[PDB]
Symmetry: C3
């Protein structure tokens, strides 16, 4: 049996200061508690747990609202700490060794992409989400950083980002043409404006309905990675999936991707051989019932396994088993 | 941003005498308690709450069984009261101003369509339901009026409707060729007979499975509104949707439309520019768990928003926001 | 109204020694307690309840592990008892009279197919399951017989089956070319090996996603029954369906068939006119909540009804009802 990726790194980022609901910090543990590692090993992949990044969580006095943003300095400091760690992991592995990141609220993506791009400047981004996460600070109704992580990364948007000194090291490292969305269904008006104005490829649930997920995936890859020349940063918000399948998340929106559609995205991205980083955001084990958490954990594990190359059509055994070798009489042998 | 419909009317009809399970009278309140109105406003639509129609609910002595029908005189009197109110609302608005009606059990449709047709005689009807709701009184196993509302409206069926004096003012205002069903999966044998005999266009879940919802919608519109010349009466039974998505309803049937399929129907109907009335029937907040009710409410709100023109691919802002106008330094400006 | 099958037999097989979770023995009762029989009758089908097969359940001392298998002698003895009963039922009915079997864990299939093939040697098998159920004894991680029932039946696999005297009467009666799988998503590596090596037709959830269920069904029938010449043994594991739709089963796997996809398989198999036996395995009413059991029961009933020829597009009445015959005045007659 052949593998596109024989080894992989696992990294937890328990961000929770990007949105007000406590519990996203438990995301990484939700996956470590699962059978994820075991299942990955059974497919013949060597998965190294690289631990957790410690987010910077300032107190209220140190981090007051600035431009309506909540916890903006905890964000800039966390973003830089994340970027350093991801960069160093990606360069140590510069076949290929994918980095699997479990969050944590989606505000971590500013840091993960920043670091990733430092090691791989020509990357593209596939953003799987019910939301755009591209609100610029003055347009955000909530001030929640998890709704803004792309806005700081996109060059074309920098005239709508307020300057802050502590954000200086957060260099916009993405062109609008390097990003493609899949799964959108709850865009804010100003996000819609920016996405259309700057030509960001986007495939909403309407598109998934009309085109089918197979054509959507194909068109998304065509738009930002036409010849599979670029490393892929796959940023997967669990809330992209339907609430029936991933209820334990802070901003659930009805009419999402089926688990199967989610699997198809990850299977195809994996199969390009260009999956460089996959991050899974917005797991919150403190939301919903016990069964809700189990469903969400289960969905997340299947998604992540798909990213690493798990095939639903089965895998071949590494060693084929033979009855005769154990000194055992078969039915065929007995009849002969 | 442009809108097909800039204003709309909202009307509650808390019918509950069309079926035995208490709670459909709470349907209108379930939607008023939601964020429906707020969400409609945020899309730039002016929605006027026109209140509730008071159904006529006679006592047992005044309204005994007649031809097996339960509460048939409460029905005829309610039907006429509804018809008057809907007619007057539709004529006051004779662009275009859609009427959104929340029930209430589906027996209200005899009245809503009667009134609608008085103002718009050439209308067509799109009936989205797991059921035919076209049982004639002697064929009904239950005697529940919510299973008969179309039978009194269809001209071709009048030789199978028993005459009752109090039904005189309920004039059959529909031809069989003006109706198309989507979502059917639990037809009674005599409904199947009448539907096929009189050539009523129907697309069951089997058809949805084999054709896909996109082709079904297209064929349904082709059958009853080929050139978008006619006003559309969209009669949406919440039980058309799968029980996983709308559990809180009295006659739930497995294997229904996904929410997305339901949204596609409403999105396409809305986009014709001919949506004249949409009614949503059979919400029952007294059925199922608290979470069941929330799921059902949520599904209903998304469906109704789609009918009014909400786009899952986003809307443009009415006023585009500019950093410089507030006297704020952007990152781009700072770097220059 | 015409019927492909006017009569049918119903048989319970409460196997529970094929897997460790208590409750599959309650499967047959779960269906008898439903409205299944009534619904089948209302479609005009004569369904005869033929009772239950009593499985042989030895004690621990009489049935120790052999080749890692758990309860292997209870299995061989049960297999032979089942085979005798099914053979005798199929020969008594040698139009056509389908046998409907409700389990019981899937280990019963070795017996049902053995008996079926005795009466109909040229049969084909459609295996609807999340799992291959084709583990050979030394490759099974669990030793659970419900994961091995096909391995004893497939001729090409007999050099990997250990000989046991009490298994002598279990004659391999299937060629690898007579079997087609639909719904696979959790194959063990050695199953994948055997399936590919011996050319067993298989359509996994990946295939369902990429091809659509319509093409999958067509290709599955083409592979093992190209000209509808052969009797069909439809072996339906309830766990083939998504856990959202059939939670009450022992080895549930996310991302399964929708109920509608399951219905389409059974509808098409039924419509060939070659449905000879359908068995439904792995119902376990002792698993999950009360609502979970109700959902699972409901899904099972709809599936079974589809197998017997129930049409979601409706059925014609046997006697058409006429208003005038009862001495009743119609609205049409009154107006004339
Ligand atoms: N992490 C996420 N979505 O994927 N947060 C949701 C953001 C929703 C909303 N637009 C906000 O600005 O807060
Ligand atoms: N409102 C509805 N369906 O949409 N009621 C269901 C009617 C079911 C059944 N045929 C009856 O006559 O009572
Ligand atoms: N009846 C069933 N599946 O349909 N059992 C599941 C078997 C799973 C696993 N391969 C085992 O050998 O035990
Ligand atoms: Mn999101
Ligand atoms: Mn997000
Ligand atoms: Mn209905
Ligand atoms: Mn209805
Ligand atoms: Mn199974
Ligand atoms: Mn099975």
């Amino acid at each position: 049996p052949k593998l596109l990726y024989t080894s992989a790194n696992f990294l937890g980022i328990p961000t929770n200061r990007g949105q007000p609901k406590i519990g996203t910090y438990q995301g990484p543990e939700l996956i470590r508690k699962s059978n994820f590692f075991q299942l990955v090993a059974e497919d013949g992949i060597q998965l190294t747990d690289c631990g957790d990044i410690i987010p910077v969580e300032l107190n209220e006095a140190e981090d007051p609202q600035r431009f309506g943003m909540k916890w903006s300095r905890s964000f800039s400091l966390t973003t830089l700490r994340i970027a350093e760690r991801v960069e160093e992991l990606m360069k140590q592995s510069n076949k290929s060794t994918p980095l699997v990141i479990v969050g944590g609220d989606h505000s971590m993506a500013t840091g993960t992409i920043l670091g990733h791009a430092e090691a791989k400047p020509d990357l593209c981004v596939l953003w799987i989400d019910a939301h755009g996460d591209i609100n610029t600070p003055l347009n955000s109704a909530s001030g929640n950083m998890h709704g803004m992580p792309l806005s700081f990364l996109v060059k074309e948007l920098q005239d709508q980002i307020p300057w802050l000194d502590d954000f200086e090291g957060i260099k916009p490292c993405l062109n609008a043409s390097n990003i493609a969305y899949i799964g959108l269904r709850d865009l804010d008006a100003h996000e819609t404006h920016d996405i259309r104005k700057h030509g960001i490829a986007y495939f909403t649930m309407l598109d998934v309905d009309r085109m089918g997920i197979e054509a959507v995936i194909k068109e998304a890859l065509l738009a930002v990675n036409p010849r599979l020349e670029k490393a892929i940063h796959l940023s997967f918000d669990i809330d992209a999936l339907d609430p029936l399948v991933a209820p334990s998340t802070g901003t659930a929106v009805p009419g999402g991707l089926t688990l199967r559609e989610g699997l198809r995205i990850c299977e195809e991205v994996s199969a390009t051989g260009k999956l460089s980083v996959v991050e899974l955001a917005e797991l919150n084990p403190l939301l919903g019932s016990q069964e809700d958490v189990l469903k969400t954990q289960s969905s997340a594990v299947h998604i992540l396994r798909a990213c690493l190359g798990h095939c639903r059509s089965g895998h071949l055994p590494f060693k084929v088993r033979n009855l005769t070798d154990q000194g055992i009489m078969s039915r065929a042998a007995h009849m002969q």
